[PDB]
Amino acid sequence: MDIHRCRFVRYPASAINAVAFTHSALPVVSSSKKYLQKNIQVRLAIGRANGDIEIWNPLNGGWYQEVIIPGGKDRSVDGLVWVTDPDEEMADGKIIHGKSRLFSIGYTTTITEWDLEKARAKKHASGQHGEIWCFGVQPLPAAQNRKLVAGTVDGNLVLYSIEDGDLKFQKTLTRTPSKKTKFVSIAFQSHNIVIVGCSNSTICAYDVRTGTMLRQMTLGTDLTGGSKNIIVWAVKCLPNGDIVSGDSTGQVCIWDGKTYTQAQRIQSHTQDVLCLSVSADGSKIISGGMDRRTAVYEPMAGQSGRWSKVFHRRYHQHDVKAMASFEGKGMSVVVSGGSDASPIVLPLRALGKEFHRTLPHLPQHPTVLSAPKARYILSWWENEIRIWHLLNSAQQFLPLNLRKNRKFLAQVLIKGASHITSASISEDGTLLAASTPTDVKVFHLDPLYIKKVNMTGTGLGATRVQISPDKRWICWAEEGSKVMISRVHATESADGISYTVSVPHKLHRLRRQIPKHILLGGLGSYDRNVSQIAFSADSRMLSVADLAGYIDTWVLRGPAGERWARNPKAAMIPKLSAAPVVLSFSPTPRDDGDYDLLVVTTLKQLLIFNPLRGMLSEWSRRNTYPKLPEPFRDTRDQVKGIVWQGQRAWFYGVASLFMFDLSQDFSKRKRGAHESGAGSKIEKHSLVPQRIRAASAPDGTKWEDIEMVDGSELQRLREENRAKWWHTYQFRPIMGIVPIEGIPPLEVALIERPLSEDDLPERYFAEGEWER
Amino acid sequence: LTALRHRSALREALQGRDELSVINILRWAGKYVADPRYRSICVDVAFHLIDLYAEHVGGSAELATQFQQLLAKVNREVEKAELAIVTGGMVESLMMSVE
Amino acid sequence: DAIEVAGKVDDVLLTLNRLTKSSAQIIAYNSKMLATKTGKLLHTYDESPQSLRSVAGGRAIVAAAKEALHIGILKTKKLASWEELAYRFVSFDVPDIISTFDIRPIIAELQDIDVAVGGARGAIYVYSNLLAHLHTLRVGTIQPRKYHWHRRAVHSVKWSGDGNYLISGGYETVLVLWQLDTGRVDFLPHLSAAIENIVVSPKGSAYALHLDDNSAMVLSTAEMKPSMYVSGIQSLVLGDRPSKDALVRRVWRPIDEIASPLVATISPQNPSHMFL
Amino acid sequence: KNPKDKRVGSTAYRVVSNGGDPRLAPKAKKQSLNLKQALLRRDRVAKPRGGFFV
Amino acid sequence: EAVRLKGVIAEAANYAKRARRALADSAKGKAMTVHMSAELPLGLKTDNKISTERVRSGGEIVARSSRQIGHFISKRRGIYSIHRISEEMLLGAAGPTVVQEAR
Amino acid sequence: CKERREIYLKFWEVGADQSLELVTRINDAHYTKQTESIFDLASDPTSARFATIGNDGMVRFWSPKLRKRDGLMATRPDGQPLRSWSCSRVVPLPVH
RNA sequence: GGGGGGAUGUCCGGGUCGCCCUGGGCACCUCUCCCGGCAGCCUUCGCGGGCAGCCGUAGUCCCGGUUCAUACGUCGCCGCAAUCGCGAGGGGACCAACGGGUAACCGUUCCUCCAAGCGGUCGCCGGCGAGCACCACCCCAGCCCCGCGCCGCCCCCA
């Protein structure tokens, strides 16, 4: 293995503008109702300043980046709202969960509901007014009659309906009297009492029924100097009735709600507050701001309505633009997103008791491709595809010549304003394919010269795209869930090779067996969108897997009489316990004509199929998950991908690396301890104490420890049917590990993306706050 | 500058500069070595800027010329200090010839 | 302290005496019990003991270990007989290296206590309700409120009268005052030396500081002006108690030493005076 | 972009323009975006961006 | 003339000694930025091995954790580098061969 | 640091309110190729004369005079003349 | 760093020629104790001592990749005393350096004179005026900034 590290691929970051849990909390049950609370679909939606809305699954500490949908050019986001109905009970007591609808704002007069099943924007709805600068749903007491409230720049509170799957602007509640007031932060103290922080240093309290004005709260001048408008950056409501609001001086104010007047001011940050969070029981307060710094606050014992800061700390490296908190199924967390592209999640109930978690700033898909025969590396973003050729091996160099060794070869820019979802290349690099949510396009390349192979039959885009290794099949995940393939024919002529695509042929996925209440509740027909696709090394077998854990495979029957039929053993292929993150055929062929399918799911579940037998390989029957090594079992790192060897497989997450010998069998992070869904516990220096020793017996020799709390037969058979593994974390920001040629030896490109202040936006300072 | 050597933060004061900033500071230095009344403090700062911004003299040749125009006064600053002592001996035993 | 043995309140003396170097023991004495020089052994603890204070009366005592703290709560009430003088103890580790501390007793009973503790990292942990948190085997999750301002060691931390201000001072010659009702700080910023010690008047009126250059200043509140001023010889002293920042391995560890004799001249024409 | 209108002086002949966003996403308003940007950046100054460069 | 060339040969010998130190550590495999061509770097500077001590507030010092040490070797890494693993690494015995682009 | 030693000498007057006031400051009281660490100081018990020895090896004798450049006497604005000490004598020392 | 070893790879006499070795070159892993600190735990008030000690190097499940900064009390005007500076503009040297041009030479930076004028610091046993107010509310014009439409010019194809 010869490795080439790379940092010249400037994958641009984007400022997270929205963090949004699909639930703020779940009602707490014991262990005996876990079977009831199992099928609750809980996710986290995030919006970044390139208009990218991405959904992750918490997975009780997993945080698998499920889907990324990017928006077009000059398209950002700033807000995000989930709309979950209360839970339904069927006629026989079966539970239908609340269908959670997703809404966003695209810095327009328009609010956009998004469809994640077809993976695009579902609906827009626009009123004739200014531009919306905060919005949210009316809370729950009505039952089926819920509404959307949106405040804007001119002021006028616009009111939308959300029921019967409709998104229509109804009417204006009220506009500000002044023409100089901007509505900047929204919250709801009651079902019908709305509290909005607003640019002219006000927090206006309205009632939504007749659009009336309860009260106004005032904020002074910033005695930090000029700019005598205070900007009420955030408002949040305590569940008991009090109101808290973060502001422009970095202060935070606490307001009694039954009279809507301030009981207390706290001077916390030095520059502005940008976001707040409250514990789901209404106990802890979190304040994150552009001093790249965030604090937590508790109620004072004794005196009512008085709170104080417990502490503060810098977690991020840029501001903390948005956040969202969750407290459910034993996981109390808050996710904070800013502009350094790295989400940071914190425990709520174990704050100061467990370490945080820096999620990968880079996307789940590696977004790096290689034609190893051509030694071409590939990376796409907003409209362009960028290609480098390496033109040399590593043993030739084994300083001054590595600069000529790498080369910025090519850069193509897509037309229109869409974004490249995915891309595929042929093994020799002569065929390129770019997939947008609007269309898919192919480009033939001659070593450059690029021509546009035009696609017929499409017109609706696709989510995933693969090209067969023999350069005959092009398959795509169209609209997430719709797998569809077209043959391409390579006709030679005196100028060279040319390629004509046939009609897209549809291949019907298998009718899976899901109960109707599960099909309706949650996000509905959602996980059916697929995440991973694979042709065999000879492109005779196709296999696809979704976010649910289902895998549908297909065989290619020859007589162009070639057509793909269903593999009958796909029925015997069972559904995975988790979402498969990586799947790949073995390029080393078997001896019985079957294939060997290596799959890893997001619980790091490693296994291998003999799919024509419809069963696991015997090596997977032997090596179990308890047989797996602990540095792979404890990673807290979703496996970004695999590269193959003859008898080895080299795995990589985002910060981790492994190699395993698939021929051989196999024989710090704690396991039985129970935490929140982020980080390990503290060991050395935590604000909570660790050893609490009571002392009876006045000689001090007798003490106490006061706790601080609020297949044997199967392995017999699997051994009667009858190491080389390695790991490191010495390549932290891995964004791509792609093979190239020129147990066999292979060259490989390890491209990373460290974050710098140069990539980062710049920090603005007035005279007072000048950081040391 | 006496204050920033006395409270020891000249190194902090100069280690974070940019191209144009060291252009200005070098221009001040090259202007003001020639006064011996603060030549010591100035050459301390000159030592520090040598330690801190000699790397990109090839990356930015206009600053290399400024690095040169540092010398381009200094090569005659040897002659001022030397001819000082050349004159410095011319006085001392004419005083001895008095007695 | 002053406690009621049967019906008479008298002075009890609590002596913290080392038994090894890394351990010590606390022993209570009456007047007659100190005369007979026998004592009531209350607690021995084994982590490099520093100090001990107690509340008014004798309900609660507090021993300062290096990283932990021991709290003794008198088991019986009203103290009928002398011999039933027993204190329930729980130990627990402060996250920083303890330099000093103060307590306000939340009160005609003793309903609670609130303890501020200062450490040489430059930090103040205030614990809100220790008696209610440790009266309840199992206890709830305790967490102090953090207060970091000073870079070097903090030396002297106390409460302001009705306890609304966390008053303090240390090495960096700034009398610092945590606001504790809002997020602000108020400081009398430039003293002549490191703040060795802070003490409070019986009323909330008069502060008195001992300052590292052998000095003492008694001020009145919000006047902050020298209302009583005393200074001493200010000489270089070999410190009995060595230093409060000599605990966490600074770049230069300050060492009690005298490398040169002192420079001084008596004034002629006025031999009653001397410059030094 | 949208084709500009052709006036006879009195009447405005316009081709209607609705082909930009088929299903993708609404195009953001950079004007309001700059408003929010300056409203953050009220009167402050930034830092020197990188290190040693022209 | 002797003092002029006194200065230059003094600094040349000093930088050559520190370069012996750095290339000894690079042959060990500590991956420092040292020169590769036969000409003098204009900056007479070498990448020292990372100070295991970390200075904290106010003046206290704790040892550098391996996490920040890896952060520091990462920032010392360059834009493009061939980092060849050995089978002696794969069994766990020896180290890699690193060649970064000449910066 | 032994090069970058900085050694001030300051002459002061004192008022009967124990006031210490500057009259002069000399930066270089003992100088050869680099500065000379000044070794000792002594007062004439009968006259306003201060002798001092440094690493130069010379002992220097300083006496206060009246600030008067070219007949114009420099008086403090209350009227009193400005006094200023000066190296009245220099004595080199023979070495063995 | 030394003193030393076991082992990796290497050339020159080489050896029946192989295990490698002696003679020269050696770089490394390892072990060894003597260098510098760091901890704990007993000892003695301390001075000191003892005890089993780690580290002098590299990439982590997450993660300290952190936590940290020094006051109000009053401002404005202009006058005196000591003290320094910038210089508009008008003059000299052509020293040096740079970049072009062989060169001549040019240009740029610099060195220096004279100076209109101008500030800045401390001490004013100077004077003089004024303290919310350099604010609230509102409105009209204005500099900047940014957004789009209209023209003006230049485009090309035509």
TrEMBL record, chain A:
WD repeats lie at residues 266-298. It holds the Pfam family WD40. Keywords: WD repeat. One of its GO terms (molecular function) is RNA binding. InterPro entries: PQQ_b-propeller_rpt, Quinoprotein_ADH-like_sf, UTP4, WD40/YVTN_repeat-like_dom_sf, WD40_rpt. GO terms for cellular component: 90S preribosome; small-subunit processome; t-UTP complex. It comes from the Eukaryota. SUPFAM superfamilies: DPP6 N-terminal domain-like (SSF82171), Quinoprotein alcohol dehydrogenase-like (SSF50998). This is Uncharacterized protein. It comes from Chaetomium thermophilum (strain DSM 1495 / CBS 144.50 / IMI 039719).
Automatic annotation (TrEMBL), chain B:
Residues 1-94 form the U3 small nucleolar RNA-associated protein 15 C-terminal domain. It is found in: Nucleus, Nucleolus. This is U3 small nucleolar RNA-associated protein 15 C-terminal domain-containing protein. The chain holds residues 457 to 555 of 557 of the full protein.
Automatic annotation (TrEMBL), chain D:
Signal peptide: none annotated. This is Uncharacterized protein. The chain holds residues 308 to 361 of 364 of the full protein.
From TrEMBL, chain F:
It is found in: Nucleus, Nucleolus. It comes from the Eukaryota. WD repeats lie at residues 31-63. This is Uncharacterized protein. The chain holds residues 577 to 672 of 960 of the full protein.
